[PDB]
Amino acid sequence: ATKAVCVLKGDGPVQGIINFEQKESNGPVKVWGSIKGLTEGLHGFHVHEFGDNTAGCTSAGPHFNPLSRKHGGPKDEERHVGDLGNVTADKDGVADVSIEDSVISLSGDHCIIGRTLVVHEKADDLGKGGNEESTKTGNAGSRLACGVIGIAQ
Amino acid sequence: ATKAVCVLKGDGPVQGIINFEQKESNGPVKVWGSIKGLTEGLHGFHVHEFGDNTAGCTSAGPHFNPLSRKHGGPKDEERHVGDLGNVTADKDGVADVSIEDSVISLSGDHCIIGRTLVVHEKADDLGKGGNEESTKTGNAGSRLACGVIGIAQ
Numbered sequence A, B: 001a002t003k004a005v006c007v008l009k010g011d012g013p014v015q016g017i018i019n020f021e022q023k024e025s026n027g028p029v030k031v032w033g034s035i036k037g038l039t040e041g042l043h044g045f046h047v048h049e050f051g052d053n054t055a056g057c058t059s060a061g062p063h064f065n066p067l068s069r070k071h072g073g074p075k076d077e078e079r080h081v082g083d084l085g086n087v088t089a090d091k092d093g094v095a096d097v098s099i100e101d102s103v104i105s106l107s108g109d110h111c112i113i114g115r116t117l118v119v120h121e122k123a124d125d126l127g128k129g130g131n132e133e134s135t136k137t138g139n140a141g142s143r144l145a146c147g148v149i150g151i152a153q
């Protein structure tokens, strides 16, 4: 099994730790942890291409997209590899994250280790907003917190 | 080429940005950047095993050592893969980092992507110190700043 971890931080109050675990290389990645400091409701949640935080979350570049597809939700055949949809924060501003995804991986061409996990200002519209930006970012707005995804013990 | 980057941060004044570039997968890796906030003199500089910052730099674990060797300087045959020796801070507390290394790699099954880069309190004794700790850490002391090594554009 392979494990990964990401510490999410940004300019504002959003802070979290997200864990990744993959039992087999041909199998799903479990993604779980807790993010606090969020507004209540939905927040876009993606893996971005670059593990570069030199200019904060901006330098992470676009969604991780090695198959050159349009943005979607995690359930869509047409999605970026990095498209994990939304997380939901409760009234106290905490998102208890629990996702399973078969398109991200912790090895190979879909490997997300060394890339950046980002949590966003607004809901990800999952490619259904009827504008060009919906097909790129899901209209998820600004990057509230991010972190480079590292190999974990 | 393959490129990586690391933002070094800690609990004190030490901070910097370190770049990695590898023109050929079977070629050397160039490592360069700057670190500020350091005491004048030598400071140990290594890749540690885990890209885990959940408990600060402590959770990075030991030096990255997939070949199970003793601690060395970068020129030694007997070294950890992560052993990049010392950087030197000037009278203003600034270390201009400029390293070329043929043991670390940005690709392949022992790559340093997703691991942690650490700059230390004290000089690395290059495993020549004559105590057990010399053979593990070079007696480089505490971890002043660290960051996960990420994929760069």
Ligand SMILES: [Cu+]
Pocket: A044, A045, A046, A047, A048, A063, A118, A119, A120, A140
């Ligand atoms: Cu995103």
Ligand SMILES: [Cu+]
Pocket: B044, B045, B046, B047, B048, B063, B118, B119, B120, B140
């Ligand atoms: Cu170290």
Ligand SMILES: [Zn+2]
Pocket: A046, A063, A070, A071, A072, A079, A080, A082, A083, A136, A137, A138
């Ligand atoms: Zn996307």
Ligand SMILES: [Zn+2]
Pocket: B046, B063, B070, B071, B072, B079, B080, B082, B083, B136, B137, B138
């Ligand atoms: Zn070492």
